[PDB]
Design a protein around this ligand. Structure first.
Ligand SMILES: [Zn+2]
Length: 265
């Protein structure tokens, strides 16, 4: 059974006891210092091809909710940018706060957002997700910030079903969801090598964090907070503040796909 979670007694500062890689050299999330994250003209444009994405179900796993996809074919794939090869979309999930002032995992010049979306993809050369997570180039995660403002129609179908998966272990059918509705206008991004942000914290991720946030209304984010960490028949623990703090960058370089206002040359 997992001891780990987000509370005082089992949260991120405890995770290294069961997962010593928590103190590794390539841990995520990180703060993105936009001065030092330099433009790299070697990076190719990102290709986010979700027109054939096939969603299957939505699940409360006790630490977030996941929308799962059929990853048996190259329907919904991420390619280009820093990536070698083709990465299949397997699921997306979110991290959010107890209030609108926090909840993202990555920060941008120390600024937090109300929530962060992670679209998780695995490298097709390895045959399945379980194999891919064992390899440094196994996963690519597209991270997208959520900024409070106008309601986002692309999120509404997700929010509308959350009352059916309130507690850990509950799932529901969730077909025909189009993840194209969760992408901002611009695909400008930062990229760096890192890790899963939950246990087992494996250093298997090429992170691609988009510069432009997508909108979310305060009401929409509030529905995330109605989910529960606990399972049915247990005392209620609101699912809030399911984000890991930023971790030391160590010797890594964050690269920008675009010229930022803090760059010069
Ligand atoms: Zn995540």
């Amino acid at each position: 059974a997992h001891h780990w979670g987000y509370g005082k007694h089992n949260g991120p500062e405890h995770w290294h006891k069961d997962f010593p890689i928590a103190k590794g050299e390539r841990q995520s999330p990180v703060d993105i210092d936009t001065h030092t994250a330099k433009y790299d003209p070697s990076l190719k444009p990102l290709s986010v091809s979700y027109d054939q994405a096939t969603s299957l179900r939505i699940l409360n796993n006790g630490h977030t909710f996941n929308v799962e996809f059929d990853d048996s074919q190259d329907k919904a794939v991420l390619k280009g940018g820093p990536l070698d090869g083709t990465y299949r979309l397997i699921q997306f999930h979110f991290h959010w706060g107890s209030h609108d002032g926090q909840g993202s995992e990555h920060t941008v010049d120390k600024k937090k957002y109300a929530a962060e979306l992670h679209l998780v993809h695995w490298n097709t050369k390895y045959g399945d997700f379980g194999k891919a997570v064992q390899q440094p180039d196994g996963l690519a995660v597209l991270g997208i910030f959520l900024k409070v403002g106008s309601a986002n129609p692309g999120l509404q179908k997700v929010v509308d079903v959350l009352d059916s998966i309130k507690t850990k272990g509950k799932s529901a059918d969730f077909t025909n969801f189009d993840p194209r509705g969760l992408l901002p206008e611009s695909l400008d991004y930062w990229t760096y090598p890192g890790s899963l942000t939950t246990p087992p914290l494996l250093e298997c991720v090429t992170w691609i964090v988009l510069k432009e946030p997508i909108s979310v209304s305060s009401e929409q984010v509030s529905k995330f907070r109605k989910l529960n960490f606990n399972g049915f028949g247990e005392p209620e623990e609101p699912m809030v503040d399911n984000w890991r703090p930023t971790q030391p960058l160590k010797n890594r370089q964050i690269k920008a796909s675009f010229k930022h206002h803090h760059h010069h040359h």
